[PDB]
Structures are given as structure tokens and as C-alpha cells.
Amino acid sequence: RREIKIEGDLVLGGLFPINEKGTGTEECGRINEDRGIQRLEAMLFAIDEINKDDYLLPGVKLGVHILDTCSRDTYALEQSLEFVRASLIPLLIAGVIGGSYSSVSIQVANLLRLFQIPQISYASTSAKLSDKSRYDYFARTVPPDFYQAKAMAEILRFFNWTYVSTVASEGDYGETGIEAFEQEARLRNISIATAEKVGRSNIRKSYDSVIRELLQKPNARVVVLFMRSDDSRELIAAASRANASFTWVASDGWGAQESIIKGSEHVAYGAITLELASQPVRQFDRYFQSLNPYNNHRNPWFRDFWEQKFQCSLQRVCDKHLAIDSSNYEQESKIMFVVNAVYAMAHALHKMQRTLCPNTTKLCDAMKILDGKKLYKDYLLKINFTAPFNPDSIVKFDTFGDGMGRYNVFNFQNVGGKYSYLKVGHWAETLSLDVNSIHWSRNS
Amino acid sequence: RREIKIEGDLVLGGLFPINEKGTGTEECGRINEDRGIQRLEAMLFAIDEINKDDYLLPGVKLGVHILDTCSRDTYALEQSLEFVRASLIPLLIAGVIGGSYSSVSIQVANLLRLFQIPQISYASTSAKLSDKSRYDYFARTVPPDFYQAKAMAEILRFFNWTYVSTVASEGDYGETGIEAFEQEARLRNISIATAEKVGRSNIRKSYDSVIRELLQKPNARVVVLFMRSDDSRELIAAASRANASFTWVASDGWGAQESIIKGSEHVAYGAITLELASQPVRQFDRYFQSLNPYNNHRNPWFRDFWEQKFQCSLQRVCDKHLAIDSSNYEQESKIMFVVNAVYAMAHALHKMQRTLCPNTTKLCDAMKILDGKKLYKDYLLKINFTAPFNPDSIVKFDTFGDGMGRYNVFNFQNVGGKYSYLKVGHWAETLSLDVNSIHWSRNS
Ligand SMILES: N[C@@H](CCC(=O)O)C(=O)O
Numbered sequence: 001r002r003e004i005k006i007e008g009d010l011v012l013g014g015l016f017p018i019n020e021k022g023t024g025t026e027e028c029g030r031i032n033e034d035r036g037i038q039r040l041e042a043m044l045f046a047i048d049e050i051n052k053d054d055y056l057l058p059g060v061k062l063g064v065h066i067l068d069t070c071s072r073d074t075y076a077l078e079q080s081l082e083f084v085r086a087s088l089i090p091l092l093i094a095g096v097i098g099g100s101y102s103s104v105s106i107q108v109a110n111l112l113r114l115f116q117i118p119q120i121s122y123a124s125t126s127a128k129l130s131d132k133s134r135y136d137y138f139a140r141t142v143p144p145d146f147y148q149a150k151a152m153a154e155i156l157r158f159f160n161w162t163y164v165s166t167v168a169s170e171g172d173y174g175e176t177g178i179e180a181f182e183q184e185a186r187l188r189n190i191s192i193a194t195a196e197k198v199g200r201s202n203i204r205k206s207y208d209s210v211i212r213e214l215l216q217k218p219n220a221r222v223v224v225l226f227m228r229s230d231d232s233r234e235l236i237a238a239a240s241r242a243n244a245s246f247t248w249v250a251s252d253g254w255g256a257q258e259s260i261i262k263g264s265e266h267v268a269y270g271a272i273t274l275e276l277a278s279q280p281v282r283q284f285d286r287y288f289q290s291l292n293p294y295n296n297h298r299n300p301w302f303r304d305f306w307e308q309k310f311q312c313s314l315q316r317v318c319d320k321h322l323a324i325d326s327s328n329y330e331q332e333s334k335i336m337f338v339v340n341a342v343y344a345m346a347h348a349l350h351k352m353q354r355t356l357c358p359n360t361t362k363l364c365d366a367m368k369i370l371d372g373k374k375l376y377k378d379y380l381l382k383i384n385f386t387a388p389f390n391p392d393s394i395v396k397f398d399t400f401g402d403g404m405g406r407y408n409v410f411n412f413q414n415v416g417g418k419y420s421y422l423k424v425g426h427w428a429e430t431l432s433l434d435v436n437s438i439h440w441s442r443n444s
Numbered sequence: 445r446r447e448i449k450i451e452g453d454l455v456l457g458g459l460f461p462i463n464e465k466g467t468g469t470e471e472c473g474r475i476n477e478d479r480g481i482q483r484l485e486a487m488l489f490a491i492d493e494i495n496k497d498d499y500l501l502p503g504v505k506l507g508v509h510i511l512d513t514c515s516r517d518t519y520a521l522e523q524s525l526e527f528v529r530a531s532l533i534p535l536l537i538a539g540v541i542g543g544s545y546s547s548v549s550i551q552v553a554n555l556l557r558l559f560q561i562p563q564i565s566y567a568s569t570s571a572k573l574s575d576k577s578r579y580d581y582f583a584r585t586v587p588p589d590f591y592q593a594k595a596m597a598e599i600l601r602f603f604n605w606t607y608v609s610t611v612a613s614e615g616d617y618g619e620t621g622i623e624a625f626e627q628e629a630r631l632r633n634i635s636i637a638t639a640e641k642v643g644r645s646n647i648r649k650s651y652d653s654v655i656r657e658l659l660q661k662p663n664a665r666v667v668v669l670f671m672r673s674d675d676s677r678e679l680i681a682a683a684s685r686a687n688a689s690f691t692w693v694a695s696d697g698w699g700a701q702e703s704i705i706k707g708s709e710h711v712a713y714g715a716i717t718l719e720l721a722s723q724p725v726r727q728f729d730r731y732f733q734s735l736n737p738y739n740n741h742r743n744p745w746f747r748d749f750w751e752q753k754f755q756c757s758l759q760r761v762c763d764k765h766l767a768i769d770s771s772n773y774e775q776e777s778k779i780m781f782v783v784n785a786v787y788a789m790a791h792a793l794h795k796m797q798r799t800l801c802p803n804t805t806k807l808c809d810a811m812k813i814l815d816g817k818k819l820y821k822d823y824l825l826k827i828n829f830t831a832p833f834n835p836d837s838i839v840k841f842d843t844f845g846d847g848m849g850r851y852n853v854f855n856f857q858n859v860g861g862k863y864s865y866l867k868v869g870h871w872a873e874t875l876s877l878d879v880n881s882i883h884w885s886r887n888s
């Protein structure tokens with residue numbers, strides 16, 4: 001068990017899938033390098049920047065309480081109890097940043113609403129979370145999957161992919177995502193050959209059995225995926241084992257992640273993926289690349305990350321001059337949303353501070369007893385330009401506390417020796433794509 | 445807001461859907477007469493009987509803390525906080541009886557496992573709840589829907605109903621129930637014409653739109669339903685509005701309930717339903733029929749129940765001689781499971797009492813600090829003959845804390861002037877049915 005507790009005048013809770021789900025029985029597995037560690041560090045980086053900002057919360061130091069979810073909603077609920085213990089060692093929590101997986105964000109939201117704690121997700125896209133009658137303290141820097149499903153149905157309609165197979169991860173992301181896709185597909189006269197579900201529970205079929213079901217309909221060469229990152233790897237690995245070749249059309253769960261395709265680049269060649277439209281935070285790259293196990297002792301998972309990333313041991317022995325750089329690192333696509341989520345919470349607290357304490361820069365008596373209801377409704381639904389790092393760059397929430405439906409379309413290609421994801425299109429309300437730039441496995 | 449707090453040496457928590465979900469926005473609606481009030485009263489009756497029993501917990505008085513779930517998992521979580529407050533006015537809770545809907549039992553279980561509180565459901569049939577790695581403190585007097593789905597697929601296979609439509613309630617009961625059915629159907633060469641989902645969330649279609657989808661496949665005259673009681677009424681009402689005629693094959697969600705069919709008996713004629721194999725508790729009938737608003741003041745919802753049931757007001761004025769009797773009352777099918785769940789908890793506590801306090805009948809020092817882990821694992825998985833009321837009548841749990849897969853098959857018929865559900869078959873591991881006794885709408 002591990003955590004990050006940095007004391008401050010106001011403390012922000014944080015939830016990241018630092019570790020994957022453990023195999024068989026174990027709660028926690030391997031370190032999730034890109035969607036775990038990087039995202040965690042993007043929150044720490046944003047907190048550091050805000051604490052250096054003389055225009056945003058001067059006189060109010062932001063502390064943190066960051067916990068691992070181990071990519072499980074059950075594990076995340078146990079961890080989330082620590083954020084509410086001080087309302088029932090435990091510190092008071094102003095707001096919560098996370099989680100990543102929609103199921104954990106849902107579980108956490110069910111608990112947090114009972115303590116009027118505002119919650120901002122930087123990656124949870126389930127349309128379920130747009131229900132304000134149920135998730136009254138929830139907001140997100142990301143859009144609902146109502147739009148991603150539409151974007152995917154429009155891609156198939158554009159290429160006349162009228163007879164397709166679907167595979168979905170069981171849970172809050174995959175099931176509602178594919179249900180939304182199936183409605184949009186039907187409105188566009190797109191038929192579904194087979195609809196498979198994957199996941200761990202006793203009711204699911206094997207990944208090899210799912211691949212066998214996909215090959216049983218050779219007519220459907222395009223497979224639409226609304227799946228989790230961990231489930232996506234298992235499916236590809238299964239496709240690779242039986243040398244199954246399909247044109248994968250995948251949601252943000254896969255996105256532009258190299259971890260899903262490393263080792264099985266052949267079986268995933270020509271894949272079309274979506275990811276939320278984002279731009280890299282250049283200052284984060286500088287910050288992340290400067291981290292090493294000798295200077296980073298506030299992150300208790302950093303040593304495990306380092307040993308996994310570089311295939312090492314401390315006390316092959318880890319070389320002292322090992323460094324995170326452009327040769328072994330790429331900024332995770334949703335980092336922009338993590339920084340924006342921390343900044344959204346900061347801007348809402350600054351505005352409440354300037355309203356309730358006009359006489360000081362400090363946490364006045366009128367603000368010591370924080371009103372989560374008012375913080376959420378009267379402040380958090382605000383407006384700001386993307387955090388002192390950016391060249392619609394405004395951070396805001398709609399009536400439902402959601403971000404804007406903007407996606408980038410990617411194609412898994414070879415470029416020039418190196419396998420990568422090339423941006424080949426965009427979706428904002430309509431689909432735009434550069435068809436000539438796409439490589440489909442073998443030509444077409 | 446209302447509750448039942450009866451102080452005792454050991455207190456049992458209780459969760460019942462006393463009220464339906466409220467329309468539009470309101471949390472609570474009409475009183476749920478049969479699956480709400482009757483079930484609540486069956487727990488109170490069992491507690492009264494145990495407190496009169498000189499062989500089961502003599503010297504240990506059983507108190508209660510019974511709350512309304514308003515047929516919502518969100519509402520049930522808020523109410524369940526009251527059971528754990530005394531571990532964080534609030535009383536200590538030995539075990540929890542409920543809930544009814546699988547989604548509420550799931551939400552409650554997520555919370556209770558964190559406080560090592562044993563939970564026994566008398567009606568939650570979701571196969572999800574058999575996962576002991578996730579629901580480690582959960583047991584139930586009822587079986588998982590792995591069996592009901594099989595029982596339903598075997599009924600269709602028996603009648604050569606090879607091209608059917610399905611309708612499922614969104615949520616933990618309907619979705620996994622129909623997913624299990626779809627696997628069993630496929631193993632029996634049964635094809636699914638259309639698969640509709642119903643429910644309240646923003647993603648679901650109208651009940652009228654679902655009926656329109658069913659009529660669009662006239663070939664599929666048999667419609668399989670894995671749906672909640674409240675959703676079942678809405679679907680029938682919709683079928684009745686457009687005079688849609690189908691052969692309904694429904695899960696226990698519909699069961700042998702008259703409330704689902706009252707007013708729309710014509711559209712549901714010839715329906716085949718399943719319900720868990722049970723026998724009425726004769727002593728409960730005596731107890732329930734003796735209740736009136738002048739003697740029942742421990743139940744704060746009884747006055748609302750009385751006014752709804754009899755179309756009354758207190759201070760048409762309610763006639764003082766109004767009585768619950770065989771002319772206006774029938775024992776709810778799952779009452780046996782409520783009494784057994786209370787008795788299961790009592791027998792586990794008695795056995796722990798006799799093990800830790802052999803010297804007394806009282807709650808000794810070695811038992812004042814209750815160990816929920818040991819209570820669940822070492823005692824609750826026990827053996828007893830159905831509570832001093834019965835003519836396999838044993839109350840026990842399998843390795844997964846589940847009851848036995850035994851179902852009764854019913855047919856909605858006219859009998860002789862009166863519309864009712866006639867038992868026409870049974871499923872225990874194989875299907876047995878009396879085909880000649882079945883009335884299908886118009887002859888066949
Ligand atoms: N959008 C995903 C999570 C995104 C991510 O981890 O990159 C979900 O709804 O679970």
C-alpha cells in the first residue's frame with residue numbers, strides 16, 4: 001500500500017491507475033507507464049506550477065492526496081474512503097482529480113456526492129456520467145462517448161463499411177459506448193455481424209474464443225472496438241496468436257498507445273483509432289524528462305516504474321545515467337486534460353477565495369468551512385485559457401459538466417522503419433479525413 | 445424520510461423497495477404493496493418469531509434497522525451509510541437483510557465489505573453477486589440467474605421457438621440475465637430477431653419505440669423478458685396501447701405478480717413466467733392479515749400503504765373495518781426467502797454465541813466486539829430446516845453463498861372468471877411441464 005500526501009492550505013485528491021489489474025487474484029500488477037505514472041506526474045507538475053503562480057491562488061498553497069486505483073473500481077472505492085474519513089492522519093479534501101476508467105469514476109462519484117466533494121475526471125468518457133441527477137458533483141475535461149460513437153459510425157459510413165463486427169469491454173465504458181455506436185450505425189444502415197464482449201468476470205468468453213467468433217464471419221473484415229486499454233492488449237495478443245487479420249476501428253481506450261501494439265505490430269497494421277483532440281504540454285515534457293529515482297522521492301511508485309521501464313534492479317543493475325528522453329518517451333495524449341482538470345479546480349477555488357476573502361490572499365474564516373455544493377455549482381462551472389502553456393483553447397464545462405466532442409483520427413503505420421500512429425483526420429461535429437495518407441495493412 | 449429502529453442486543457439491518465422509483469425527478473413514488481410492504485413485514489414477523497424462540501437466541505434479543513431503497517441503488521447507498529456511521533443516534537449492525545433489486549444489493553455490498561458486515565439478499569439473482577473475490581461478505585437465499593437463463597432457453601427449445609425477440613432492463617439484473625440467456629439460446633440453435641433494452645437513463649429508447657421494434661419482426665411472436673417489475677409494467681402498458689400481441693416468456697422480475705398485469709390482462713394473456721420455487725409461510729398470512737393502521741405503528745409506511753391499497757383518506761374516508769384478507773391479498777412468492785434470510789443470520793449468530801459464550805445465553809465479553817469476517821466464513825455458511833413453518837427444505841449456502849437453482853413455471857390464464865397465474869411446470873436441473881394445462885392467448 002502506497003500514497004502521496006503533500007500538506008497544503010487546501011488539499012486535492014487524486015486517483016490514477018498507477019498499476020494494471022493483477023493476474024488471477026492479486027489486486028495490483030505491472031506499472032501502467034503512460035496512463036498511470038505520466039498522468040500522476042502531470043498532476044504533480046500542475047500543482048507545482050500553480051504553487052509558483054502569483055496570479056492563481058497566491059497565499060493559498062495546494063497540497064495533494066494521490067492514490068492508486070490498480071485499474072479496479074473495487075480497489076478505488078477502498079482508496080476513496082481515505083478522502084472522506086476526515087469528514088466521518090486523514091486530511092480534509094477540497095476536490096478530487098480522477099479517475100481514468102469510467103467504472104472507477106462512477107464508484108468514486110457515488111461516494112463523493114454524499115460528502116459534497118467536487119470531482120473532475122481527465123479521462124472518463126462514459127455517457128452515464130453526464131446524468132446530473134445521479135452524478136451531481138461530477139465534472140470532466142473530456143466529452144461523453146455519445147460523440148465518439150457518432151464519430152466512429154461516420155468513419156464506417158464514409159468507407160461504406162456496412163457489415164462490421166463489434167467487440168466491447170464489459171463495464172461502464174465499453175457497454176454504453178458500443179450501445180451508442182449500435183444506434184448511430186443503425187441510423188446509417190450499418191449492420192452488426194457479431195457483437196462480442198470481453199472482460200474478466202465468470203460470464204465472459206476467452207479472448208481466443210472471441211477471435212474465433214470474429215473469424216466465423218469472414219464477410220466482416222472491419223472490427224469496431226469499444227474497449228479498455230488492458231482488454232485491447234489481450235484481444236490483439238489473441239489475434240496475433242491465431243494470425244487473425246482485421247481492420248480495427250478502435251475508441252480512445254486504444255487511442256494512440258504504443259503499449260497496445262508493441263510485440264504485435266503486424267496484426268494491428270492499418271488500424272484506425274480515435275483519441276480526444278489534444279496538444280502536448282511542452283513544459284510537462286521538460287519536467288518529466290528531468291525525473292529520475294535520485295531526485296523523485298515524493299512518488300513512491302517511481303522506483304518500480306524505473307525498474308520496469310529500463311529492465312533494472314537497484315539494491316542487471318540500473319545504470320546511474322539512465323534518463324527519460326525523446327528516444328524512450330512520448331507524452332501521453334490525455335496529459336493536457338490532467339493539467340486542465342487540476343487548473344479547473346484551482347481557478348474555481350481562486351474565484352471563491354476572491355469572493356469570500358476580498359481583504360486577503362489567505363484562507364479567511366468565511367472559507368475555512370468549505371461549501372462543496374456552492375464550490376461545484378457557483379464556481380467550478382467557469383472559463384479560462386489553457387494553463388500558461390498553449391499557442392478553442394478555453395477550459396469550460398457545459399450544463400452537464402462535460403468537455404467538447406472533438407476527436408483526432410489516427411492510422412497505425414510504418415512511416416520509415418519505425419511503427420507509429422499518424423493523424424489522418426478530425427471530428428468536431430462533422431468528419432474530416434485525409435484518405436490518401438492512410439495505409440491499410442496491404443495497400444487497400 | 446422514514447425508518448424502523450427497534451433496539452436489541454444485536455441489530456439487523458434491512459433494505460426493502462417500500463416505494464417505487466419516483467416519476468421525472470422525485471426519489472420516491474407509489475408504495476410497492478407486494479414486493480415492498482409485505483417483504484418488510486415478513487422481516488418484522490421473522491424477528492418477532494425469533495424473539496419468541498427459546499431454542500434460537502434465548503437471552504439475545506434481535507433488534508432491527510429497516511430502511512427504504514425507493515427501488516434506486518443511489519438512494520440505497522445513502523440509506524446504507526446509516527448502517528456504517530456507528531463504525532465511523534447510529535446503532536451497531538450485526539448483518540444486513542436485502543436488498544431486492546440486484547443493483548441496490550451490489551451498491552450496498554461495495555460499502556458493507558469495507559466494514560466486514562455480512563449481507564443476505566432474499567431476492568437479488570444477478571450472477572455478478574456470485575463473485576466472492578468482489579462480494580466477499582455477500583450471501584443469498586436465492587440462486588444466481590445462470591440457472592434461470594438456462595431454464596428459459598430450455599422452455600423455448602422444448603416448444604421449438606427458434607426465432608425470438610428479447611427485451612432487457614438496463615442494469616445489473618437485466619443485462620447479465622439476458623447475456624446468460626443469449627449464450628444458452630445459441631447452444632440450442634435459437635436465434636435472436638431483435639434485442640431491446642429499456643430503462644430510464646438518457647441512452648434508452650421509449651417503451652412505445654421498443655414495442656414498435658418488436659412489431660417490425662412479425663416472425664418473432666415469442667418475446668423473452670429479463671426485466672425489472674417496474675419496467676415490465678411500462679412495457680406491457682405500451683404493448684396494451686398499440687394492442688401488440690406477443691407470447692411473453694418472462695424472468696422472476698415479472699414472476700407471478702398481478703400488479704404487472706392489472707388493467708392490461710388482455711395483452712399479457714398466455715404469458716409464460718418463471719419464479720423461484722417456493723411455498724407460502726402460513727403463519728405469515730395470519731400475521732399480515734391481522735395488521736391495520738390502528739395496531740401497526742412500528743411501520744411508518746403502513747398508513748401510506750393502507751390509503752393506496754384501499755383508495756382512502758385518514759385525517760373517501762377510510763372505513764374502520766377495512767381488513768387485509770384472502771379477498772384482497774395473496775402472499776408474495778419470495779416471502780419464504782425473506783424469513784429464511786433473517787433465520788440464516790439468526791442461526792449463524794446463535795452458533796457463534798454457543799461457541800464463544802458456552803457459559804451463558806447472553807452476549808458475553810468475547811462476543812461484544814463482533815468479528816464480521818469470522819461470522820461470515822465460519823458460521824453463516826451453515827444448515828437448518830425451513831424455520832418452524834414447512835411440511836429439500838433445508839436452508840444452506842453453496843461455496844459461492846448462493847441458493848439452489850429451482851424454478852416454477854407459470855401461465856397467465858383466466859381459470860373461471862378470474863385472471864391468475866397457474867403453475868404449469870418446474871426446473872431443478874431439467875425441465876418438467878404440463879403442456880395440456882397451458883392456455884396460449886387463442887388456443888395455441
Ligand atoms: N475514456 C476511457 C479512459 C481513458 C483512458 O484511460 O485513456 C474510459 O471511459 O474508461
Ligand SMILES: N[C@@H](CCC(=O)O)C(=O)O
Pocket residue numbers: 479544545546547567568569570617673696697778
Ligand atoms: N431477482 C430480481 C429481484 C427479485 C424481486 O424483486 O422479486 C433482481 O435480481 O433484481
